[PDB]
């Protein structure tokens, strides 16, 4: 068994030599070519490192590794790392069995990236759902950098818990996160009040909305 | 059998043209701890010219 | 088992060259541990090393001995030999052959060792082995008298080798005439008249002299 | 092709002659082609049959 | 050169701890590996000590030492000595140039051995031996622990004329001495006289054979 070992998370800032580390279970390492993928969220894995010291055409020179051979483990190194390096890396190598295993994944993380506000947006329902017979409030959260985001609800003058469903935060394309909330509701509740605020909780700072049905 | 040969970081070269290479010194002498030969064979190479 | 066995001429001349030859089993000397040594002792002094040899060529003398030891060796027979030209009187010693470890970081630990032989340089009477009888309770007792003899490296054996139980050796002393002595004894119980006769056997390494006598 | 290396099949090295046409060779004398016998056994330039 | 140098003999009761330290005359003794070995009486050296902190399989933990550069002494440490530890012991080194040196060599005896009284042994010349023309009587001198032992021999009335060998004592594998002695005379001799002894002298006892040839 040839089972390869990744830390959770690394951090590092920008513009220099950030090492990302894999350790092997047992085996050999010598045995069997170790390889590294790069996965994105919402995305298929994409081969950077083969043979152990060799890189395809259109990747960066960045990216780099060596293997230890005192350890029996595997590094992967970028020279001059950036903004858009950031993403999950995976040690894959082969067992003596013809066993292919892949590593547990390490989650890159961007240190040197500034703080953010989130871009709180709020729809209300419209027609063709008012026909349906139904509501449903869309609060969007989005570019916000931490990951701490909370959601909150208020009515026309006190707080109100109805079914309320959040999104879990994700990574976008840029590097950013994203959220979504929802409240359903009643027509007929809904047209008994005069307003509906969401409220979201940042690190510093908070944004309501208060959209009011009518007029 | 020379002196003094020089160091890997300037590593001499020397260059072999216009003479009988007669590979057979090296079989007379033989204090070799290792010898391999790529591509070419070791009971060939009399047999062969470069 | 590695073992290593002492071999060559017993008897050397004064002023001449020395020879010895020591044969190795259960090893490559080419890839075992490289290098090869030999070591001599004197009667009651300590080891002096004397020289190794690599399979290559390469090799180390004794600077207080560099003029006289000359050291070669077998690839093939797995034998390595030493010579030394210019013999004295003082010479005689006690010769082994050892190995050294190479394949670590250093040269170090002398592990294995010979057998051991005790060369002679000395000419002067020059004679060959005697053997003589000695004269024999609930025990009994006898033994064997070996006389005559020049060459020190002399080996004895009680019934072949077979059933050795109570067999007992002397140290050996040099006559006034040139002539060592040596003595060995066993002692064996009354009723053992039966079976395993009470034969001592001598053999004469220098000379390959062999004698079985009751 | 076990995984500890399956070394049940083997090819003859070098011969001194080329096989014929179905010819079967099993001989498992140590081949030499240097400039010195190997006495059956594998010297410093001497090569297994198989 | 890289001269070793070592003390003859030491000597100390059982049960105790022993100090034995090989100094180099010449060169640092550190820049080398430095070995000891034991040789029994009657056997060959064996290994004991090397890389001057290490010890084999098979000897006792009873052996351990280490080196010291700045006195250019080689410590060596016996805890729990016994009778079986009774051997020679030998320092070595390598010089600089390559040149392996041995020590002087160290006898080690143990002191606290009980006493022992020496057994005697005679032979007389048997006729295969007359029948040639000669004759010479065997003494056996053994099982006794103190060197002081001398010999003695007497025919009836007086010493015999005839010359008389003796042995040079020597320690045996079992922790005791060996010796003998030899006297060569004419059958004539041997016949023309009444007996003949092999006399051992100890402290404060001796013992005879009194080996009568007629009768």
């Known amino acids: 068994e040839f089972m390869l070992t990744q830390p959770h998370s690394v951090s590092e800032s920008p513009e220099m030599t950030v090492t990302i580390s894999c350790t092997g279970s047992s085996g050999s390492i010598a045995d069997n070519y170790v390889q590294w993928y790069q996965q994105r969220p919402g995305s298929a894995p994409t081969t950077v490192i083969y043979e152990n010291y060799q890189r395809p055409s259109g990747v960066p020179n960045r990216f780099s590794g060596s293997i230890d051979s005192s350890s029996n483990s595997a590094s992967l190194t970028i020279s001059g790392l950036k903004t858009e390096d950031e993403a999950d890396?995976?040690?894959?190598?082969?067992?003596?069995?013809?066993?292919?295993?892949?590593?547990?994944g390490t989650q890159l993380t961007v240190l040197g990236q500034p703080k953010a506000a989130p871009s709180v947006t709020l729809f209300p329902p419209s027609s063709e759902e008012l026909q349906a017979n139904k509501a449903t409030l869309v609060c969007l959260i989005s570019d916000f950098y931490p990951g701490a985001v909370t959601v909150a609800w208020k009515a026309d003058s006190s707080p109100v818990k109805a079914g309320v469903e959040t999104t879990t935060p994700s990574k976008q394309s840029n590097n950013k996160y994203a959220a979504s909330s929802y409240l359903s509701l009643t027509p007929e509740q809904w047209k008994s009040h005069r307003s509906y605020s969401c409220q979201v909780t940042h690190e510093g700072s908070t944004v309501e909305k208060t959209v009011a049905p009518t007029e | 059998n020379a002196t003094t040969f020089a160091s890997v970081y300037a590593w001499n070269r020397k260059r072999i043209s216009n003479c009988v290479a007669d590979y057979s010194v090296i079989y007379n002498f033989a204090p070799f701890f290792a010898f391999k030969c790529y591509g070419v064979s070791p009971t060939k190479l009399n047999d062969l010219c470069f | 088992q590695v073992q290593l066995q002492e071999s060559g001429p017993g008897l050397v001349s004064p002023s001449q060259t020395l020879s010895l030859t020591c044969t190795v089993s259960?090893?490559?000397?080419?890839?075992?541990?490289?290098?090869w040594s030999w070591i001599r002792q004197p009667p009651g002094k300590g080891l002096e090393w004397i020289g190794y040899?690599?399979?290559?060529?390469?090799?180390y003398y004794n600077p207080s001995l560099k003029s006289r030891v000359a050291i070669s060796v077998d690839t093939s027979k797995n034998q390595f030999s030493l010579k030394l030209n210019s013999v004295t009187a003082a010479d005689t010693a006690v010769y082994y052959c050892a190995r050294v470890s190479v394949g670590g970081r250093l040269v170090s630990t002398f592990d294995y060792w010979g057998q051991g032989t005790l060369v002679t340089v000395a000419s002067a009477s020059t004679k060959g082995p005697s053997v003589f009888p000695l004269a024999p309770g609930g025990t009994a007792a006898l033994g064997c008298l070996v006389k005559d003899y020049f060459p020190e490296p002399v080996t004895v054996s009680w019934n072949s080798g077979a059933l050795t139980s109570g067999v007992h050796t002397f140290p050996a002393v040099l006559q006034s005439s040139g002539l060592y002595s040596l003595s060995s004894v066993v002692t064996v119980p009354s009723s053992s008249l039966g079976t395993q006769t009470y034969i001592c056997n001598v053999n004469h390494k220098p000379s390959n002299t062999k004698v079985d006598k009751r | 092709s076990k995984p500890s290396g399956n070394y049940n099949y083997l090819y003859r090295l070098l011969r001194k002659s080329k096989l014929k046409p179905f010819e079967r060779d099993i001989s498992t004398e140590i081949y030499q082609a240097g400039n010195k016998p190997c006495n059956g056994v594998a010297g410093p330039n001497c090569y297994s049959p198989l | 050169e890289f001269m070793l140098t070592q003390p003859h003999s030491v000597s100390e009761s059982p049960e105790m701890t022993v100090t034995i330290s090989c100094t180099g005359s010449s060169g640092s003794i550190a820049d080398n590996y430095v070995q000891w070995y034991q040789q029994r009486p009657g056997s060959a050296p064996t290994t004991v000590i090397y890389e001057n902190y290490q010890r084999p399989s098979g000897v006792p933990n009873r052996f351990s030492g280490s080196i010291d550069s700045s006195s250019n002494s080689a410590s060596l440490t016996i805890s729990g000595l016994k009778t079986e530890d009774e051997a020679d012991y030998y320092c070595?080194?390598?010089?600089?140039?390559?040149?392996?040196?041995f020590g002087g060599g160290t006898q080690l005896t143990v002191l606290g051995q009980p006493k022992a009284a020496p057994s005697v042994t005679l032979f007389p010349p048997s006729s295969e031996e007359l029948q040639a023309n000669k004759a010479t009587l065997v003494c056996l001198i053994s099982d006794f622990y103190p060197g002081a032992v001398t010999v003695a021999w007497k025919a009836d009335s007086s010493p015999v004329k005839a010359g008389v060998e003796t042995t040079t004592p020597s320690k045996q594998s079992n922790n005791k001495y060996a010796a003998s002695s030899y006297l060569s005379l004419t059958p004539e001799q041997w016949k023309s006289h009444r007996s003949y002894s092999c006399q051992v002298t100890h402290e404060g006892s001796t013992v005879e054979k009194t080996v009568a040839p007629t009768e």
């Open positions: 040899i690599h399979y290559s060529g390469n090799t």
């Open positions: 259960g090893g490559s000397i080419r890839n075992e541990v490289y290098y």
């Open positions: 070595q080194s390598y010089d600089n140039s390559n040149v392996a040196v």
